[PDB]
A = this chain, B = another copy of it.
Amino acid sequence: DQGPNVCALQQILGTKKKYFSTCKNWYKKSICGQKTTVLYECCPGYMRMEGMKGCPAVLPIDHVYGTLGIVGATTTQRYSDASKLREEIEGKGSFTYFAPSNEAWDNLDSDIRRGLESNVNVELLNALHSHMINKRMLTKDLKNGMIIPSMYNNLGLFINHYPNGVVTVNCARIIHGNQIATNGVVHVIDRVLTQIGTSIQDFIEAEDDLSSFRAAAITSDILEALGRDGHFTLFAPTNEAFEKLPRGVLERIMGDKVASEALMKYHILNTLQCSESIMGGAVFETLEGNTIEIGCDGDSITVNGIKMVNKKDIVTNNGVIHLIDQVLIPDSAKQVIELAGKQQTTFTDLVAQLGLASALRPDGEYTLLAPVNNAFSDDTLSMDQRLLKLILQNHILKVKVGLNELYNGQILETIGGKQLRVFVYRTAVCIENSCMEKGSKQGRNGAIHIFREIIKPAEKSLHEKLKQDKRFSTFLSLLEAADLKELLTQPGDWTLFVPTNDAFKGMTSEEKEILIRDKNALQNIILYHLTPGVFIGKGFEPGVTNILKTTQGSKIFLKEVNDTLLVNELKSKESDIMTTNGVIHVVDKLLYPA
């Protein structure tokens, strides 16, 4: 357990992946979402002493051949003996031996293994030499991207060195590294090295199970790049993956050069990521531009959280290939309705169930204003689905409008012939009565934006809202006394604080006669309640006091706290009453500039 020169051999629970480390720093944490079991023993070569803690004694080093046995690579040792490599790695020189573990030899195909045992003089010797370098190279010398000639026919050894400490040779991970030998060093790797493929393109053209992906590739003029030099990571979708897609989707993406090209580039990484370098979740930029999330669940590689990898670490002269169960479809290749996620299903179901999905033609460009599922109450879903169909028609535009194109005062046109006002604030974008959330996406033929509430375009003007309610009567009269009816009737952008008749019943009529004598003070007192521009409370950043200049001249202060709108530190009763030419906030008492 505790002591000097103690080594821990961990194994991820539920897998065969083993990680061998010294006890210098704590290495204990979940790997690939799973805990590990640990085996403590003296690091190879070190020994225990009586009455002492740990392993304070050490044995002398041996030659490379004996070090094969010191590290437990007894099968590699036997094969080294049978091929007469033993006498070379016992003599003069300095050698690096990437020795496959015993389990690595057990995992090798039986026909290949028997083929090696039947030709020990040449083929077996050439394979073991393929596992070797004619110089001593520690793991700190095996830099990422190095191509080091081996000891057989100068065959290239492709080194990868990752920030997490994983060192791979032809994607074979080094389990036990840096066992010093009198004439070299031994590193125990997790698989037997094999002949690398010619290139990724050549593997695609050769493999029949990648026929579909090949065709698409040749259609997208991207297969040529996968044959040139480089260090790519390709997530190749098999023919099963293409069969999984809905009908016509593959035909639709293939019929369009842009969607097909983006679809192809979305599977390719510009760097080499061996499977054994994945110890957790990370994001990687694809050639399409957008990223994919690569992770691991036990010994299963996950792509975008899906355990879709079935065959991994297909190494080739220009990078690695991992076969996957599904096709990776980037947003830039999806139809607009396909851009929605979980919290929009209701919306996307409704527009499908009420006959609007067919109106989103592939040759058109559209914008979906999708409310979250929480925005559809039972009372809303209980209305007649024709009215609900009109409402949904207020959430679809026949023009693609990206989030980066919206501006204050912009007017959007729904497919239902209605107009939507865009209000841009410092920290929020609100369309009519609904404000945007995060999660906007752009696709092949449109964009989608997520909203907290259902968008309901206003139907009454300020004047109609004022005269339809009785509690505003007196105030309305004053507004008409100031010749503001034409303002409250014509289109525009205003913010009006409407004091109820209760505020004037705090004046009790007499002060309305005292104010009636003033044909000028009513202009100030009344005009202070009006402000140019539409300022809704749910568009503010919470807690911050907004200083606005009313049309009267003096300042007014609006603060949104706990979903309540305060005006001059006075809690308003009703707020965000939308009209066609402004917004109304109902206040309890009168407002003065002070």
A175 CA / B520 CA spacing, docked (Å): 50
Which residues from chain B contact A427 at a C-beta distance below 8 Å?
180
Q: Is the CB of B405 within 8 A of A58?
A: no
Are A56 and B405 in contact (CB-based, < 8 A)?
no
Determine how close the nearest CB of chain B comes to the CB of A404; give it in whole angstroms.
4
Contact A557 B57 (CB under 8 A): yes
Q: How many angstroms between the C-alpha atoms of A407 and B180 in the bound complex?
A: 11
Task: Assess the B56–A545 pair: CB atoms within 8 A.
Answer: yes
Number of residues from A at the complex interface, CB < 8 A: 45
Q: Is the CB of B92 within 8 A of A407?
A: yes
Q: Is A571 an interface residue (CB 8 A)?
A: no
Query: Taking the complex as formed, is A271 at the interface, i.e. its CB lies under 8 A from any CB of chain B?
Result: no
A564 on the B face (CB < 8 A) = no
A408 nearest CB neighbor, chain B only? B182
- Judge whether A14 is part of the interface by a CB distance below 8 angstroms: no
- Could you say which of B5, B58, B543 contacts A547, with CB atoms under 8 Å apart? B58
Q: Please name all residues of chain B whose beta carbon is closer than 8 Å to the beta carbon of A537 when the two chains form the complex.
A: none
Q: Say how far A246's CB is from chain B's closest CB, in angstroms.
A: 31
Of B45, B61, B404, which is within 8 A of A94 by CB?
Answer: B404
Chain copies in complex: 2
Q: Which of B4, B47, B426 contacts A61 (CB 8 A)?
A: B426
Selected from B56, B406, B425, B547, the residue in CB contact (under 8 A) with A544 is B56
| Cβ contact of A58, chosen from B56, B408, B545, cutoff 8 A | B545
Closest to A548 in B: B60
Q: Is the interface of A mostly helix, strand, loop or mixed?
A: loop
* Contact across chains for A136 and B94 when beta carbons are under 8 A apart: no
- Whether A5 and B56, one on each chain, are in contact in the complex, defined by CB atoms closer than 8 angstroms, is no
Max count, chain B CB within 10 A of own CB: residue among A94, A407, A533:
A407
* 394-439 of chain A: CB within 8 A of chain B: 402, 404-410, 424-427
Interface string of A104-129 (1 = CB under 8 A from B): 00000000000000000000000000
Structural contact, B182 and A546, CB atoms closer than 8 A:
no
Partner of A404, one of B61, B135, B548: B135
User: Which A residues, 54 to 71, have Cβ-Cβ distances below 8 Å to chain B?
Assistant: 56-61
Cβ–Cβ contact B59 & A547, under 8 A: yes
Which residue of chain B is the closest to A61 with respect to CB atoms? Answer: B426
Contacts of A180 in B (CB 8 A): 426-427
Q: Give residues 428-473 of A contacting B (CB, 8 Å).
A: none
Given A47-B547, A545-B49, is A136 in contact with B57 using a C-beta cutoff of 8 Å?
Answer: no
**CB atoms of A426 and B136 under 8 A apart:** no
From residue A439, how far is it (CB to closest CB) to chain B in Å? 14
Residue A183 is within 8 A (CB to CB) of chain B in the complex: yes
Q: Is A563 an interface residue (CB 8 A)?
A: no
**Cβ of A533: which chain B residues have Cβ within 8 Å of it?**
60
How many angstroms from the CA of A541 to the CA of B4 in the assembled complex? Answer: 13
Binary B-proximity of A36-64 (CB < 8 A = 1, otherwise 0): 00000000011101000000111111000
With A57-B545, A533-B60, A547-B58 known as contacts, the answer to whether A408 contacts B137 (CB < 8 A) is: no
Q: Answer whether residue A93 sits at the interface, using C-beta atoms and an 8 A cutoff.
A: yes
- How far does the Cβ of A412 sit from chain B's closest Cβ, in whole Å? 13
Neighbouring B residues of A405 by C-beta, 8 Å: 93-94, 135-136
Residues of chain B with a CB closer than 8 A to A93's CB: 405, 407
Q: In the complex, A46→B543 CA distance in Å?
A: 13
- What residues of chain B lie closer than 8 Å to A404, measured between beta carbons? 94, 135-137, 141
1/0 contact string of A1-29 vs chain B (CB within 8 Å) = 00011000000000000000000000000
A371 within 8 A of B: no
**What distance in Å separates the Cβ of A382 from its nearest Cβ neighbour in chain B?**
39
Determine whether A177 belongs to the interface, using a CB cutoff of 8 Å to chain B.
no
Q: Is A499 an interface residue (CB 8 A)?
A: no
A424–B544 touching, CB < 8 Å: no
A184 at the interface (CB under 8 A from B): yes
Taken together as a complex, chains A and B put the C-alpha atoms of A56 and B93 apart, in Å, by 74
Name the B residues within 8 Å of A141 (CB-CB). 404
A545 to chain B, nearest CB (A): 4
Docked complex Cα distance between A427 and B45 (Å): 12
Q: Enumerate chain B residues within 8 angstroms of A45, measured Cβ to Cβ.
A: 426
With beta carbons under 8 angstroms apart, the residue of B58, B92, B135, B410 that contacts A410 is B92
- Bound together, the chains give a CA A182 to CA B137 distance in angstroms of 61
Instruction: Find the B residue at minimum CB distance from A49.
Output: B545
A residues 475-520 in Cβ contact with B at 8 Å: none
Chain B residues whose C-beta falls within 8 Å of the C-beta of A57 in the assembled complex:
544-547, 557
Give Cα A503 to B543, complex, Å. Answer: 90
- CB-CB contacts below 8 Å: A522-562 with B: 533, 535, 541, 543-548, 557
Asked if A425 and B135 sit within 8 Å, CB to CB, the answer is no
A 88-112 binary contact with B (CB < 8 Å = 1; else 0): 0000111000000000000000000
A63-93 interface (Cβ within 8 A of B): 92-93
The listed residue (B135, B183, B406, B544) touching A5 by CB distance below 8 A is: B544
With A56-B543, A61-B424, A180-B427 known, 9 other A-B pairs at CB within 8 A are: A57-B544, A58-B541, A58-B546, A60-B426, A61-B408, A92-B407, A182-B409, A183-B408, A184-B407
| 28 A–B contacts, CB within 8 A, in A order | A4-B543, A46-B544, A56-B543, A56-B545, A57-B546, A58-B541, A58-B545, A59-B547, A60-B533, A60-B535, A61-B424, A61-B425, A92-B407, A92-B409, A93-B405, A93-B407, A94-B405, A94-B406, A94-B407, A135-B404, A135-B405, A137-B404, A180-B426, A180-B427, A182-B407, A182-B409, A183-B407, A184-B407
Closest 7 CB pairs between A and B?
A: A182-B408, A135-B404, A183-B407, A57-B545, A136-B404, A94-B407, A58-B544
